[PDB]
Design a binder for this molecule. Structure first.
Ligand SMILES: O=S(=O)(O)c1ccc(Cl)cc1
Ligand SMILES: O=S(=O)(O)c1ccc(Cl)cc1
Ligand SMILES: O=S(=O)(O)c1ccc(Cl)cc1
Lengths: 727, 397, 396
């Protein structure tokens, strides 16, 4: 029946009633290191809540604490990813039972305090929000937020309903819910999520009980009563019927559609709807509405795509899934960066920010200084906005040493080369520093296409030569593509793997093939757009198809960044990479468009003119002559065809990389495509997109193949699916 | 079977929004004044024969709630059997009230019907009633809601209507409305509004700026400049940027006003000694995409022509509501309307667009202009919010 | 008058109660969209482009029910953008007026196929939310002698001489005949259960019903300043108004919606639709605004006069149970046999969702005529302000 239980598991909550009658519910799940919202917790909190109601006459207050390093964070992701549309009833009743426990604990008629010792994320913060007072220990690593939206879910444990009641529709959505922002305890108290702070975890429970004692003394009637359970409650910013909010309320779905650029992410749409519809009714009816939207998301395919990529795949990467087994940790004392371009300067920045000592070499002291100015202007932006101190920024810049003498690479044990994309140049740059650095030094290269095996012949210690591929802007791109040459040792992989985590980035390990995985797959994306441009499709529809597919940058705009002259060089390198290898090349339709733009002196933003027009550096509108050059408008295919063509090309090329052994795991394929070339997160990755494809044909891998054949009939045989995707 | 005839078609002057003359006047009082005028025109009219009173009202709240038509029946002392019903089809509520009144006459289940509309936008601004497609994110996100003003800028962007092109039409409406007033065209149909003492409150359309120059229209700023721009282009992906051409000088005016039309069968009119002034030939409803919104008239006007076996060359006068300048120019471009057959006495850009009453105002305006010109046919149509459209053809008798 | 208007489908949602109702969490737009999705489910191959208008009655068109709720229904349900959509408000008879206006549109020959019905989520948009002229203009309220619908019903019971037992006796009768109608499965295929976006059930029955109602329990209820004095100033020959009406013998405040598909013989044959009834005649009339509820008596006579029929020719009568005294007066004035009047219960037991009640009790008779295999039925409603609407249907 209607109860605090759902429908054998261990106990999660320790019970303790003191002399004064304050009950301490200490969460300590014995089946893991972190308190997690699972079947065991629900049954445990159910027993505890039943006991709080039974012994109400001898209970004056409640304190919710945790025995772990963290307060409470996460859920049974192994379970929610398996929820089917027919399971929507069970999913609804589960979150309804969870909120029925918190609502009883909330309307207990006595104060309940949350002693937040560590990370209170999502379901954990949803527990604390059910309390009447929240105290947090201001310790390192502690975070608070509702990041359910980043997994395709929504805060279905009262998170949406309560944050709206506390902050209003606009603030709760924009600041907390829509992006699942994690807050440090200082910022948490600042915006109102936490009420007061303490310096250490030991002071929490004594301060929690002291607040309960003082509250029952000063505020007797208002004790154990939330603001929305009092008469005369006024929601901040007003309700949807309030004339002030009702004027700007229609812009919330349109502003949200503008930020998502039309991408099919159903989570923020559901959060906004559940937030508004929840503010139109009472608290209980609002939470039940919140449950129905939560059951809508969990049964959806996108939630499975994101739970696969941003939970299981990302943890398999951080656990060392691609790091060789057995190899141990090796320190890094001095990083030597050859080259001070936007790549070399960013590499020096992200390394010095991690605390590493950097030597930034370039062919001139003037250029190496300009490279360090990148880190100075980056800290200036970080000091104007006030995200760092004046003293920590001085120590960061002091760790970077610009130079032009190859003798200053003495004592370097980690070399990262970022010179021009040329093999004989890289052979010389490495040849004159390999004897100056340490004998165990890592000789890393930042090349985008040129195979590592060829570049490694320029050094004698080839087992320490390895590809360390970054992405610009280096201070913001989170992926590092580590390429394994056929001479690179497994120890060299692990050292670069550990270095990548040390600078706060996510690594993937890739075997040495031309184009690697990121540059090769993003090329198929750009080439599909240029092919559509040559076919006569409107340029605005192409950029719309990219933004609506979920890409961060539209394809033609990115084609000006990547420089069209470089694209011509890659096409020539791929042609003679198989022409001089005994066969003939299949020229992509985009190659003709690349060369027509090159002929017209429009090679991209670097030239100052490309598919767009550039004035004062800033991009400003598509080139007006573009429509007449390629007869734009003569071909008007469906927008979903343009969207699917770009997504399928990358998905199929990703499948090729797995079939060729370029990638060793789909987790590297998904996270690599998402963090490396900006594949849409709702897809869950270019490999997850295959198994999670949902269209008019249906859902599954077989639906993907049928759709790939449909595209292959009308657009070209490059969309024909590989043998590995068939029965 | 039966035929529907228009015996009377009057309206109030259109008082402007800022410091307007009709702001102190309740919208109910505006409709009552038109009922009291219809009594003056026919004091021996048997009001028992009036079987329904249909009023359009787009924002039916506040002073305009509680079936404002029924309140007009009771406050004006009309027989309690005379019905009274409010409807809302956005910008066409005034004309949909007339069309519904005619369709009730043709069905043989209604004898003599009053129809029109009322909208005191200075007292009840549009959006006051709320709405799902605006204040509900689930359906707003799905229907791609975009205000009418941006769809108008998109029409001008697609069709290639410059800022000079729309302002050139705004001046045309201002000039032809001043000529119609100076020429005395509106004298018998615009019933001045008076207070409970008989003192004059308003006798002319205030929103008119007859001393308008093309140089002054260019000084105005594009007033309609959220993410609605990006929401619109997500549907119309082949358009790169929206050229915001519409200002307060080439868009419909925000005013107060009311209109009334008497419609009945030939037997009902002959029973009361009424002279029919026009006959409702046909009606039709049809629309287009809700994002661009204001392209609904073109299929509705084509449909009302195919239903009556007529073409553009059979129509002597076209009257499209001047909600936005680009809407009329787009309408003139599609059906190839002659320039001297289109909104001949000015329109909403000069005199105003009182949502609920505009449909019945321009309807009566064509009745008075067919008789003044001794012409035969006229077509009335309006664009609607949400992507709808209505059209009506009348014939002079 | 040429084209005959036929009823092809007529469905409705269950009526959820006001206090802790199951439909309180459902936006009224979703109630209509649910019925549109049901009509598609019953006719998957129907060319929705033939649908030219969607007419919805709504007495409180504000909040969730503003901005042309009918137009939102068309756009939210993905119906063709040419299908229009218009909201109308004639107080209680808005649901039936939307049907009559649809039928009259088909008769005029300028419309082929029209959806017509109503929606009213009184638990979310209560009566009076839209304001009103006869409340915000004391000059108008003073002149029209405004009296709420309840006091007029008490006045009718005072004049005609209906005792507190007399009205509670009919209340027990409606509760009984409604529970019997549900048990017999009369509503099995016409009440479409409301479901959420996940397919979970929200409501499958009229939850305002009190089937275990007893004579004693009704007599224990209590009846629900100035308005009494105002009414007697018009009806000066009455000394005191007997307040007989309680919550148990009056209509129920509920949430609900209804949809009726009306079209011509060509529209039905072209889409392969079986006509279930035929609109014979409609009429609008009314009476005094202070008594407010004696409107359906001249409306029923004018629709019978227009169809060439009399009281004896009608097999079933369906008058909205807005108040028990209104039905007893309507029965006494025309001598309607007690076995022909609201034979499947009414608003006292199942509820009165203002804008939708007209289309609900219309579809109730369309189903009951086929069950009994009878021919003619008459549907009428009293209206606030002193109006009336009636309709005659014949089984096909
Ligand atoms: O009790 S179960 O339904 O198995 C369940 C427990 C925890 C989560 Cl997070 C989801 C489902
Ligand atoms: O029906 S199950 O798949 O066990 C399930 C129930 C509840 C949740 Cl929150 C997730 C999954
Ligand atoms: O609070 S989050 O960390 O976003 C989270 C919520 C639910 C699950 Cl199942 C996993 C993680």
């Amino acid at each position: 029946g209607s109860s605090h239980h759902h429908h054998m598991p261990d106990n999660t909550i320790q019970w303790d009633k003191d002399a004064d009658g304050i009950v301490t519910l200490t969460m300590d799940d014995p089946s893991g290191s972190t308190n997690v919202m699972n079947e065991a917790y629900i049954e445990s909190m159910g027993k505890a809540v039943d006991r709080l109601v039974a012994e109400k006459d001898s209970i004056t207050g409640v304190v919710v604490a945790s025995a772990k390093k963290t307060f409470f964070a996460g859920g049974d992701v192994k379970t929610m990813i398996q929820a089917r549309p027919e399971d929507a009833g069970d999913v609804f009743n589960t979150v309804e039972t969870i909120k029925r426990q918190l609502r009883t604990l909330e309307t207990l008629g006595k104060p309940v305090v949350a002693a937040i010792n560590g990370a209170a994320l999502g379901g954990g913060l949803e527990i604390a929000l059910a309390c009447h007072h929240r105290i947090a220990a201001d310790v390192k690593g502690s975070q608070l937020g509702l990041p359910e939206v980043t997994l395709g879910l929504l805060p279905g444990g009262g998170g949406v309903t309560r944050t709206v009641r506390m902050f209003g529709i606009q603030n709760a959505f924009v600041s907390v819910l829509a992006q699942g922002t994690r807050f440090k305890p200082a910022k948490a108290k600042e915006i109102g999520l936490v009420d007061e702070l303490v310096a250490t975890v030991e002071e929490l429970v004594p301060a929690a009980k002291a607040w309960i004692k003082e509250e029952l003394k000063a505020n007797p009637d208002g004790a154990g009563v939330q603001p929305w359970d009092k008469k005369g409650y006024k929601m901040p910013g007003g309700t949807p019927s309030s004339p002030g909010l009702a004027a700007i309320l229609p812009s919330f779905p349109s502003n949200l559609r503008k930020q998502l650029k039309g991408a099919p992410m159903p989570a923020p749409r559901a959060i906004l709807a559940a937030a508004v519809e929840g503010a139109q009714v009472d608290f209980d009816t609002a939470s039940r509405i919140e449950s129905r939207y939560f059951a809508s998301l969990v049964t959806g395919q996108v939630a499975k795509n994101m739970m696969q990529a941003f939970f299981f795949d990302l943890q398999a990467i951080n656990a060392g899934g691609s790091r060789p087994e057995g190899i141990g940790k090796t320190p890094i004392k001095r990083i030597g960066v050859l080259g001070a371009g936007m790549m070399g300067a960013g590499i020096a920045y992200v390394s010095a920010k991690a605390g590493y000592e950097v030597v930034l070499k370039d062919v001139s002291l003037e250029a190496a200084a300009k490279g360090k100015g990148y880190s100075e202007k980056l800290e200036a932006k970080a000091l104007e906005r006030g995200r760092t101190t004046q003293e920590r920024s001085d120590a960061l810049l002091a760790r970077i040493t610009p130079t032009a003498d190859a003798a200053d690479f003495k004592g370097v044990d980690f070399v990262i080369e970022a010179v021009f994309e040329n093999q004989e140049l890289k052979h010389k740059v490495f040849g004159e520093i390999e004897d100056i650095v340490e004998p165990n030094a890592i000789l890393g290269s930042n090349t985008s296409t040129l195979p590592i095996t060829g570049l490694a012949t320029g050094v004698k210690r080839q087992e320490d030569f390895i590809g360390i591929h970054f992405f610009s802007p280096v201070d913001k791109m989170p992926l590092v593509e580590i390429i394994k040459g056929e001479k690179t040792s497994d120890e060299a992989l692990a050292r670069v793997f550990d270095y990548t985590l040390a600078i706060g980035k996510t690594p993937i390990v890739v075997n040495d093939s031309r184009g690697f995985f990121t540059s090769r797959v993003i090329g198929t994306f750009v080439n599909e757009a240029l092919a559509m441009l040559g076919e006569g499709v409107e340029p605005a529809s192409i950029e719309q198809a990219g933004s609506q597919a979920g890409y961060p940058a539209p394809p033609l705009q990115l084609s000006d960044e990547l420089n069209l002259e470089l694209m011509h060089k890659i096409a020539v390198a791929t042609r003679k990479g198989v022409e001089d290898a005994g066969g003939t090349y299949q020229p992509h339709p985009a190659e003709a468009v690349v060369e027509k733009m090159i002929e017209l002196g429009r090679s991209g933003r670097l030239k100052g003119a490309g598919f767009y027009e550039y004035a004062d550096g800033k991009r400003s509108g598509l080139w007006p002559g573009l429509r007449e050059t390629f007869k734009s408008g003569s071909s008007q295919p469906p927008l979903q065809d343009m969207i699917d063509r770009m997504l399928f090309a990358e998905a199929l090329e990703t499948q090729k990389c797995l079939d060729e052994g370029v990638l060793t795991s789909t987790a590297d394929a998904n996270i690599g495509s998402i963090m490396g070339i900006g594949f849409p997160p709702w897809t869950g990755g270019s490999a997850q997109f295959i198994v999670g494809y949902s269209g008019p044909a249906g859902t599954g891998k077989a639906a993907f193949v049928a759709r790939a054949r449909e595209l292959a009939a009308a657009y070209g045989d490059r969309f024909l699916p590989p043998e590995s995707l068939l029965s | 079977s039966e035929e529907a005839f228009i015996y009377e078609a009057i309206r109030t002057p259109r008082g402007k929004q800022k410091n307007g003359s009709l702001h102190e006047v309740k919208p109910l009082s505006l409709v009552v004044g038109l009922i009291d005028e219809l009594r003056k025109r026919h004091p021996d009219l048997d009001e028992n024969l009036i079987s329904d009173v249909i009023l359009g009202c787009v924002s039916p709240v506040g002073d305009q709630g509680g079936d404002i038509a029924r309140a007009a029946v009771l406050a004006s002392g009309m027989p309690v059997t005379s019905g009274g019903v409010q409807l809302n089809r956005f910008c066409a509520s005034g004309l949909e009230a007339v069309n519904t009144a005619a369709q009730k006459v043709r069905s043989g289940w209604d004898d003599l019907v009053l129809a029109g509309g009322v909208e005191s936008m200075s007292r009840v601004p549009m959006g006051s009633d709320g709405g799902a497609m605006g204040l509900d994110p689930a359906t707003n996100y799905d229907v791609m809601f975009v205000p009418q003003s941006i769809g108008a800028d998109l029409i001008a962007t697609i069709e290639g209507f410059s800022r000079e092109d729309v302002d050139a039409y705004a001046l045309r409406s201002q000039q032809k409305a001043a000529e119609a007033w100076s020429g005395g065209y509106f004298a018998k149909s615009v019933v001045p509004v008076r207070d409970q003492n008989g003192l004059l409150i308003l006798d002319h359309d205030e929103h008119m700026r007859p001393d308008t120059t093309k140089e002054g229209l260019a000084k105005l700023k594009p007033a309609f400049e959220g993410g609605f721009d990006d929401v619109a282009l997500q549907k119309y992906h082949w358009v790169e940027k929206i050229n915001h051409v519409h200002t307060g000088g080439n868009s419909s005016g925000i005013v107060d006003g009311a209109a009334l039309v008497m419609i009945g069968s030939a037997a009902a009119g002959k029973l009361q000694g009424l002279t029919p002034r026009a006959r409702i030939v046909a009606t039709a409803t049809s629309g287009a995409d809700p994002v661009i919104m204001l392209t609904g008239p073109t299929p509705a006007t084509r449909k009302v022509l195919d239903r009556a076996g007529l073409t553009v060359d059979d129509i002597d006068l076209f009257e499209l509501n001047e909600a936005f300048a680009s809407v009329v120019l787009k309408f003139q471009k599609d059906l190839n309307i002659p320039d001297e057959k289109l909104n001949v006495n000015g329109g909403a850009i000069a005199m105003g667009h009182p949502l609920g009453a505009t449909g019945a105002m321009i309807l009566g305006t064509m009745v008075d202009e067919l008789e003044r010109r001794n012409a035969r046919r006229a077509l009335i149509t309006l664009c609607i919010g949400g992507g709808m459209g209505v059209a009506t053809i009348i014939e002079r008798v």
